[PDB]
């Protein structure tokens, strides 16, 4: 599965980069680590 690095934008949407920045709905990604206020964290897609 590809890992995303996502953060709050400048439903809920996250600003994510792959592996160049795309906006994903929070419902379509799954945190891989604690989500952070004002910081990025890693996610995977809900399909994978």
């Amino acid at each position: 599965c590809v890992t995303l690095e996502c953060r709050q934008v400048n439903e809920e949407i996250k600003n994510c980069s792959f592996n160049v920045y795309a906006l994903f709905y929070r419902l379509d990604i799954v945190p891989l680590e604690e989500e952070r206020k004002g910081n990025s964290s890693k996610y995977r897609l809900i399909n994978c």
Epitope: V30, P31, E33, E34, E35, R36, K37, G38
Partner: antibody
């Protein structure tokens, strides 16, 4: 639902060593961050330690760093806390707690019933 | 080390609004999410508020959380106080080393 049942602990002397165990029912353990939190009688909650679902990342409160070791065994839905170099001030009820994916691993929604640890000469 | 300081005690009468503050001693309150837990007598804590101001399903809307950057504080407001709200309340965040930290806790009395 998910239920957490702590076992182990008990009485020990300063400098002694105990192991806590926590058995989790349910289906989410292998994806949950797991925490230990303790509470001395009549005192506030004190966060102790946490471990990622894949055991690769652990954190410890300054008060226990170097003396406690958190670990888990996902195939058995079990969390551990190895408590070495015990001090009287480690006396407290210790709670197993789950930080699940739905909170972004940010909050403890399910707590165990607790296990007493008493350190005394 | 960082301390999240709460009033030792708060009291209100049924139906009133009460507020519980949580003041971070060092750093910025906005560096990390604040959470709030309720611990009723003889029971384990439950989540009231996470991610600063989000309520889990089942938590009544009379609980709300807020952040005040200018005072480096977070607050839990309970409107329409009810008898079952008598509990200890703890804020929770994390520090510069990414260790989680609870506030000292507040005992809320519903005067009856």
């Amino acid at each position: 639902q998910v239920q957490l049942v702590e076992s182990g602990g008990g009485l020990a002397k300063p400098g002694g060593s105990l192991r806590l165990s926590c058995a989790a029912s349910g289906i989410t353990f292998s994806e949950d961050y797991m925490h230990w939190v303790r509470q001395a009688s009549g005192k506030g909650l004190e966060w102790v330690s946490r471990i990622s679902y894949d055991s690769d990342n652990t954190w410890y409160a300054d008060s226990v760093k170097g003396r406690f070791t958190i670990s888990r065994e996902n195939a058995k839905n079990t969390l551990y806390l190895q408590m070495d170099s015990l001090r009287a001030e480690d006396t407290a009820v210790y709670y197993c707690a789950r930080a699940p994916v739905w909170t972004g691993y940010t909050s403890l929604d399910v707590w165990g019933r607790g296990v007493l640890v008493t350190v005394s000469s | 080390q960082v301390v999240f300081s709460q009033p030792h005690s708060v009291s209100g009468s049924p139906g009133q609004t009460v507020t519980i503050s949580c003041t971070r001693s060092s750093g910025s309150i906005d560096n990390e999410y604040v959470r709030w837990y309720q611990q009723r007598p003889g029971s384990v804590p439950t989540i009231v508020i996470y991610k600063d101001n989000q309520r889990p399903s089942g938590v009544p809307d009379r609980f709300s959380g807020s952040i005040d950057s200018s005072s480096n504080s977070a607050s839990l407001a309970i409107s329409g106080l009810q008898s079952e709200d008598e509990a200890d309340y703890y804020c929770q965040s994390s520090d510069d080393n990414f260790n989680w930290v609870f506030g000292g806790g507040t005992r809320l009395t519903v005067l009856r």
